[PDB]
Amino acid sequence: YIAVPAEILGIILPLLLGVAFLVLAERKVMAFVQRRKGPDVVGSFGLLQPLADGLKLILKEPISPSSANFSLFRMAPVATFMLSLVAWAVVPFDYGMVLSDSNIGLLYLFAISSLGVYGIITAGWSSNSKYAFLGALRSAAQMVSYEVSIGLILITVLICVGSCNLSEIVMAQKQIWFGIPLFPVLVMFFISCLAETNRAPFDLPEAEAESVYSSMGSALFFLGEYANMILMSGLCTSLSLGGWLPILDLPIFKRIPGSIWFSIKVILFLFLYIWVRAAFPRYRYDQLMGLGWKVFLPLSLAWVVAVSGVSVTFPWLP
């Protein structure tokens, strides 16, 4: 009865710690890329930087908005936050080390992504000015296009292995990582995850909003974005790179707790996010949506067809 709230707290709080240190490590590693050090004064190694920024944003004198000042403005950031976390519900960190074995996990993740789209659009429109509304529409369209691409990719990885709950998928990978044969599929899925949260090369919506509001509201919004980032990284490494499985299967690796492997893979993908951020200019909006509807949809569909074909001719399909 009381164990469940304990598990939920133990899932929520460490995620917030990790996402604060995520934005910290983001600044640090982009700095190191650009031939400079990051924040290195406050902490012993800059470790006390996110805590200091949080305390500053707390003591900062707030400013309540003047646009539907209740039940529509002080709710939508909480909506996107709740959506990101409830997505974080069903993710396997080890054998049985999950919160809920929802036997249709993949559909669940896809639905939650769409609901995040709802979160961002209502948070955009809840404001007063209209340019924020146009930006919200742009972000919604981008997010939903790359969601349909993500959907087709999920269908591929699902064809490769019968069931849907993620533990079964990671066993299927326990034979051999699906990232190996479907490497282009992994690349496409990663680009779609990049476009899904607007991070590295696709930023013109946010860039324009910065080119043309509550402190805690903006903090909650950025928190939701980066949490969704960690989630996308996590499911990418949970269904295309192995998910707590040692490499080369030698009984010296089997001393590592398994959970460590999942953390190593997700930290590698986070580092790849931050790395591909600081190497490339940004697309426009036209070219962005054009690539979404011309380059990734047909490729993903063709890949579904091809993998189904290759796995239906030989008795290789469980």
């Binding site: 490769c160 034979q175 699906f178 044969p181 490497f183 796995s311 290789w316 469980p318």
Partner: peptide, 16 residues
């Protein structure tokens, strides 16, 4: 590598 990965997926699904 794609063909060989598919063959490996086949053997693994046989085992499973």
């Amino acid at each position: 590598t794609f063909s060989w990965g598919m063959y490996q997926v086949g053997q693994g699904n046989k085992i499973r």
